[PDB]
Ligand binder design. Structure first.
Ligand SMILES: CCCCCCCCCCCCCCCC(=O)OC[C@H](COP(=O)(O)O)OC(=O)CCCCCCCCCCCCCCC
Lengths: 70, 170
């Protein structure tokens, strides 16, 4: 499963793997709400945001993130 | 013009399997046009619900008849917003295209709800197609919308079923 920015893909995988364990084994079992994946998350999201800055879509994404569909 | 479509599907497995499948749906062989997906934000909120925004890139192609009206569109960005409520076993999801919205906006709400009396997760979908840019002839755009809705209904549920399986088989 690739990131839209290829330099972020291996970082995404590591974050996704950590989240997947946390989600199944902790969140759904009501055993945690802490960010136990913060290391993998902040590394990944740093790589993504650096990439998004140069992306034409960024303003449309920023707007979309303010809306509340639910 | 606004066109609303609806569908329902039942997955005969538990909430944890469906909601996990949703977060891990890509890649699968039923969605070959999804080039990438990224998580943009994720946090647990005030009420203990999981809030996730993701960004997908998808390739595509316009039908030939729209050639004199529309230029070549071959890629689209899609936002995907979801809320998981573990106390209720509910997952709400929303998607829409981020670009080409002046030509056509396609919005989808899909809710996954576990029903314990039947030990199944029911998926209700509603999809709205909206456009104020009238290109081309209305009934052909409508046909396109029905075709697209039906294709997505099947791709979505086949992909989900594929991934639920693969995770079941470890
Ligand atoms: C004839 C004129 C046409 C004009 C063309 C204008 C170009 C822009 C149109 C692109 C709009 C597409 C974005 C729509 C976003 C949206 O609302 O929701 C639909 C989105 C994408 O829509 P599209 O497949 O139509 O591009 O769902 C996807 O993410 C699809 C990814 C590939 C298939 C995987 C299956 C998952 C589908 C959804 C899962 C949810 C569960 C329940 C489903 C029943």
């Amino acid at each position: 499963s690739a990131s839209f920015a290829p330099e972020c893909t291996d970082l995404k995988t590591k974050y996704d793997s950590c989240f997947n364990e946390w989600y199944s084994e902790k969140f759904l079992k009501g055993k945690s709400v802490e960010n136990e994946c913060s290391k993998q998350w902040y590394a990944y999201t740093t790589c993504v945001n650096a990439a998004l800055v140069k992306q034409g879509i960024k303003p449309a994404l920023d707007e979309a993130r303010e809306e509340a569909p639910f | 013009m606004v066109l609303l479509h609806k569908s329902t599907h039942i997955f005969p497995t538990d909430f944890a399997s469906v909601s996990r499948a949703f977060f891990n749906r890509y890649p699968n062989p039923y969605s070959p046009h999804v080039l990438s997906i990224d998580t943009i934000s994720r946090n647990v909120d005030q009420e203990g619900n999981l809030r996730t925004t993701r960004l997908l890139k998808k390739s595509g192609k316009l039908p030939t008849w729209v050639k004199p009206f529309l230029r070549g569109i071959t890629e689209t960005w899609i936002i995907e917003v979801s809320v998981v409520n573990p106390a209720n076993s509910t997952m709400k999801t929303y998607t829409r295209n981020l670009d080409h919205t002046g030509i056509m906006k396609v919005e989808e709400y899909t809710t996954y709800q576990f029903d314990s009396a039947t030990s199944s997760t029911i998926a209700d979908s509603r999809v709205k197609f909206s456009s104020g840019f009238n290109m081309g002839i209305k009934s052909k755009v409508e046909d396109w919308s029905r075709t697209k809705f039906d294709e997505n209904v099947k791709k979505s549920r086949m992909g989900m079923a594929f991934v639920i399986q693969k995770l079941e088989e470890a």
